[PDB]
Amino acid sequence: INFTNINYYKDSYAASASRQDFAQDPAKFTRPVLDAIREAAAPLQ
């Protein structure tokens, strides 16, 4: 029985940390290329 993530103030920024939206999108840093290269393929053919 969990009783947390409760805001006691009318201002939304007084709430606790937003710790329920873990999203991992590494492609914008790891594969930031136009031509999607398959793993099994030689990249520069």
Partner: protein, 249 residues
């Protein structure tokens, strides 16, 4: 499922042909876009001089030598006095634009070397100074180093990017290598990155454009000594608001 080595980049009346290209880095997977109505704050209608400013401007050619440290440009500053882009950048207070940075360095199959072409957002240039009082001039970089113009600026300490950050982690930025055995060009398409929808093209430089030789240019006697490095950049989706008298700096 592979990247074709041939590529043609047609923007405006400019066209760039490359036959040894690695790929095209789309910075952070985001194409340059015009400022949406939701993200805009300025009320004036922006000018979008599509083909007069969005085009490839070949700006600088730097001779790669064996002991060369590297060069860096600041994207708005490197075009602020060139073409119709510069005029719009001077006549308008506000500006936003992506770019298609295309670095060119061709060498024979008997040359070797590797450049690191990276586009660094908010490339704050550091000064290398001894322990001194905040009064000291050496603690802060002069304007020639913060805004090198179109000529660029030779790196003093490319190992720390002249920013106190290790060059080895500069690959966290949108980057591409020019490995002379592999490719002769590096293309980076960078969208407008800023905490603001528009910003002054004169005061604020959104991105740094570093070209650092990681593997030094080595060749044998008889090979062509002069191995140039050319920077051709093209604004993409350039907007300008706040028309007034043209301001240089």
């Amino acid at each position: 499922g592979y990247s074709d080595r041939v590529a043609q980049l047609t923007v405006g009346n400019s066209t760039i042909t490359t036959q040894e290209a690695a790929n095209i880095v789309l910075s952070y997977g985001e194409w340059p876009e015009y400022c949406p109505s939701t993200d805009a704050t300025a009320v004036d209608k922006p000018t979008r001089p599509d083909v007069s400013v969005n085009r490839f401007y070949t700006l600088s050619t730097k001779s790669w030598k064996t002991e060369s440290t590297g060069w860096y440009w600041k994207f708005p500053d490197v075009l602020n006095d060139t073409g119709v882009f510069g005029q719009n950048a001077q006549f308008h207070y506000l500006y936003r634009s992506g770019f298609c940075m295309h670095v060119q360095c061709n060498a024979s199959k008997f040359h070797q070397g590797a450049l690191l072409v990276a586009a660094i957002p908010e490339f704050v240039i550091a000064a290398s100074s001894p322990a001194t009082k905040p009064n000291s001039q050496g603690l802060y970089p002069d304007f020639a180093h913060t805004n090198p113009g179109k000529d660029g600026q030779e790196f003093r300490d490319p190992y720390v990017l002249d920013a106190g950050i290790p060059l080895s982690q500069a690959l966290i930025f949108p980057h591409q290598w020019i490995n002379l055995r592999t490719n002769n060009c590096a293309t980076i398409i960078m969208p407008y990155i800023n905490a603001l929808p528009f910003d002054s093209a004169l005061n604020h430089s959104n991105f740094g454009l570093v070209v650092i030789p990681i593997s030094p240019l080595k060749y044998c006697n008889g090979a062509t000594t002069e191995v140039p490095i050319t920077l051709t950049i093209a604004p993409l989706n350039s907007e300008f608001s706040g028309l007034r008298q043209a301001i240089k700096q």
